[PDB]
C-alpha cells in the first residue's frame, strides 16, 4: 500500500535544488506515500512539538506541571521568543510556555522546557519511550539550527516523525486529556499558514508544527489532518539544500504536501 499512485517529487526538489523527504499515512487504510522518507533531516523548530508532548507526558505523573509558574531572567532570552519575551517581568506557566514554543516557536521557551526534562537526551529518552528509535536531539536553540549536510545531530526521518506523531496524536502514546491539549496546541499553530496547511482545504481541520533552520535550505513541517468524512492524514514534509546560503520555500513545503493527498487519493 505503498505509492500506489506515484508523484512527481523528483521534479520538485530538482527545481527546488535540493532534496524534499515526505511521508504521509492514511490512518484508514494504512495506505502510504513516501519519496526519501527514511534519510535524515534537520528537525530545527519541529521538535517543539514533540518537547510539548514530553512535557505533557510527564504531568500525567506530575498532577501540577502545567499549572507551575516558571520564572526567567533576560539571559534566558534567544532570539525569536515573541511570547516568553512578553512575560520576561512576571514568568510564564508551564503550560504557557508550551503553547509558545508549539504555536509561536518560541525559542527561550524551548530551551526552558528542555531544561525540565532534562535537555536534549531526556526529550530523546521520551522518544525512545513511544518507539522512535531515529530521533536524536543533540543540542540546544539556537546552536540546533545548523544543519550541516551529512550531522545526524538534531535531526530524524520523516517518517520516524509522522510515526511518532501519530502515536502521540491519534494513538495511545498520551492519555486521552493530554492527547487531546497536544492536538489543541497543534491546531492553534501561527506559523505554519503557508506550508501543509496551504495544501489542505479550509473546512477541514489540521494541527502542525513547522521548523526553519535558517541555513541549508532546510525547513519543513508536519501536521495531522482531520478531512471531512474519512480517517485522519499524518504527515511530514522535510527539506534541505547543499549550499549554506541556498533559501529555503515554503511553496515546496505546500506543494510537496499537496503531491502526498493526491497520492494517497483525498480529493483536496
Known amino acids: 500500500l505503498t505509492n500506489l499512485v506515484a508523484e512527481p517529487f523528483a521534479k520538485l526538489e530538482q527545481d527546488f535544488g535540493g532534496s524534499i523527504g515526505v511521508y504521509a499515512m492514511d490512518t484508514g487504510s494504512g495506505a502510504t506515500v513516501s519519496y526519501r522518507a527514511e534519510e535524515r533531516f534537520p528537525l530545527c523548530s ?5 518537547l510539548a508532548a514530553a512535557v505533557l507526558a510527564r ?11 516558571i520564572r526567567y531572567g533576560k539571559n534566558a532570552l534567544v532570539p525569536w521568543s515573541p511570547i516568553s519575551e512578553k512575560y520576561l517581568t512576571t514568568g510564564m506557566t508551564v503550560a504557557e510556555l508550551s503553547a509558545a514554543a508549539v504555536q509561536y516557536s518560541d525559542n527561550a521557551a524551548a530551551n526552558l522546557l528542555l531544561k525540565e526534562l532534562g535537555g536534549p537526551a531526556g526529550l530523546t529518552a521520551f ?7 531515529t530521533f536524536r536531539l543533540d543540542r540546544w536553540e539556537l546552536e540546533l539550527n545548523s544543519a550541516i549536510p551529512g550531522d545526524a545531530r538534531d535531526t530524524s526521518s520523516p517518517r520516524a516523525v509522522t510515526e511518532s506523531l501519530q502515536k502521540l496524536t491519534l494513538g495511545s502514546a498520551l492519555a486521552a486529556p493530554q492527547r487531546q491539549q497536544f492536538v489543541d496546541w497543534l491546531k492553534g499553530n501561527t506559523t505554519g499558514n503557508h506550508r501543509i496547511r496551504a495544501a489542505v482545504p479550509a473546512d477541514w481541520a489540521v494541527g502542525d508544527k513547522t521548523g ?3 541555513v541549508y ?9 482531520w478531512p471531512t468524512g474519512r480517517a485522519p492524514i499524518v504527515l511530514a514534509v ?3 539544500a547543499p549550499n549554506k546560503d541556498d533559501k529555503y520555500s515554503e511553496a515546496v513545503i505546500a506543494a510537496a504536501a499537496r503531491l502526498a493527498l493526491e497520492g494517497l487519493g483525498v480529493n483536496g
Open 212 to 214: 526553519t533552520c535558517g
Open 217 to 225: 535550505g532546510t525547513a519543513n513541517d508536519y501536521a495531522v489532518v
Open 127 to 133: 522518544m525512545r519511550s513511544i518507539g522512535d528509535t
Open 238 to 240: 522535510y527539506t534541505r
Open 46 to 50: 519541529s521538535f517543539k512539538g514533540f
Open 59 to 69: 504531568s500525567q505523573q506530575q498532577a501540577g506541571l502545567l499549572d507551575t509558574p
